[PDB]
Amino acid sequence: GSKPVSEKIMEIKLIKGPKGLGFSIAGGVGNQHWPGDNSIYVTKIIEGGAAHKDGKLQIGDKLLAVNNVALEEVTHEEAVTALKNTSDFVYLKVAKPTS
Amino acid sequence: GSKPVSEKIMEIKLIKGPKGLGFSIAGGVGNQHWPGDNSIYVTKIIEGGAAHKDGKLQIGDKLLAVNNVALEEVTHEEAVTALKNTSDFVYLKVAKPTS
Ligand SMILES: [N+]
Ligand SMILES: [N+]
């Protein structure tokens, strides 16, 4: 048989404009998005924001890192802080679904 | 922009029969499959062998491990030895193309 043991991982490079990165997240320790699951997930992509304009990030993608900040097993508040603490240029590390 | 930084990784579980695993490999330190590339690649899947029957392994797949034996930066001869030294049950770790 065959089964995924880890996901394809993409690095998405964005330039943040006055409209911001324009995506929403859910999940994290203390805000689990599914039972037993601490991952950060992308839940909304806002029209006109950098993520939407670039076109690569997708709802349901798992956010593993922002810049040098690992988001693999962190609280929701820590992920939110990491996103807010971005400059003009942002590197996102995302896991894609394995289906 | 978006670009892959690492591949989806599959674990393929096979039962080796009298016909064997039935696949060929190329690459490794001292047998590089492309310039600057030390990876082990699957080059042939033999009709009727375990890999072909199971259907999941594909020509061009990158073989990262056989059982507990890492093949990430090894000689060609070391990869061949790792494959030959398999029992009935084999775990293959494979990277899939990111396209
Ligand atoms: N994938
Ligand atoms: N993939």
From Swiss-Prot, chains A, B:
Post-translational modification: Phosphorylated by MAPK12. Ubiquitinated; by MARCHF2 which results in its degradation.
Domain of life: Eukaryota
Entry-annotated residues carrying Phosphotyrosine: 91
Location(s) in or outside the cell: Cell membrane; Basolateral cell membrane; Endoplasmic reticulum membrane; Postsynaptic density
Tissues of expression: Abundantly expressed in atrial myocardium (at protein level). Expressed in lung fibroblasts, cervical epithelial and B-cells (at protein level). Expressed in the brain (at protein level). Widely expressed, with isoforms displaying different expression profiles.
PDZ domain residues: 11-97
Domain comment quoted from the record: The alternatively spliced domain I3 corresponding to amino acids (636-669) of isoform 4 is an EPB41 binding site mediating association to membranes in polarized and non-polarized cells.
Family listed: Belongs to the MAGUK family.
Assembly and oligomerization: Homotetramer. Interacts (via guanylate kinase-like domain) with DLGAP1, DLGAP2, DLGAP3, DLGAP4 and MAP1A. Interacts (via guanylate kinase-like domain) with KIF13B. May interact with HTR2A. Interacts (via PDZ domains) with GRIA1. Interacts (via PDZ domains) with GRIN2A. Interacts (via PDZ domains) with KCND2 and KCND3. Interacts (via PDZ domains) with KCNA1, KCNA2, KCNA3 and KCNA4. Interacts (via PDZ domains) with ADGRA3. Interacts with KCNF1. Interacts with CAMK2. Interacts with cytoskeleton-associated protein EPB41. Interacts with cytoskeleton-associated protein EZR. (Microbial infection) Interacts with HTLV-1 protein Tax.
Cited function: Essential multidomain scaffolding protein required for normal development. Recruits channels, receptors and signaling molecules to discrete plasma membrane domains in polarized cells. Promotes epithelial cell layer barrier function via maintaining cell-cell adhesion. May also play a role in adherens junction assembly, signal transduction, cell proliferation, synaptogenesis and lymphocyte activation. Regulates the excitability of cardiac myocytes by modulating the functional expression of Kv4 channels. Functional regulator of Kv1.5 channel.
This protein's name: Disks large homolog 1
Gene name of the record: DLG1
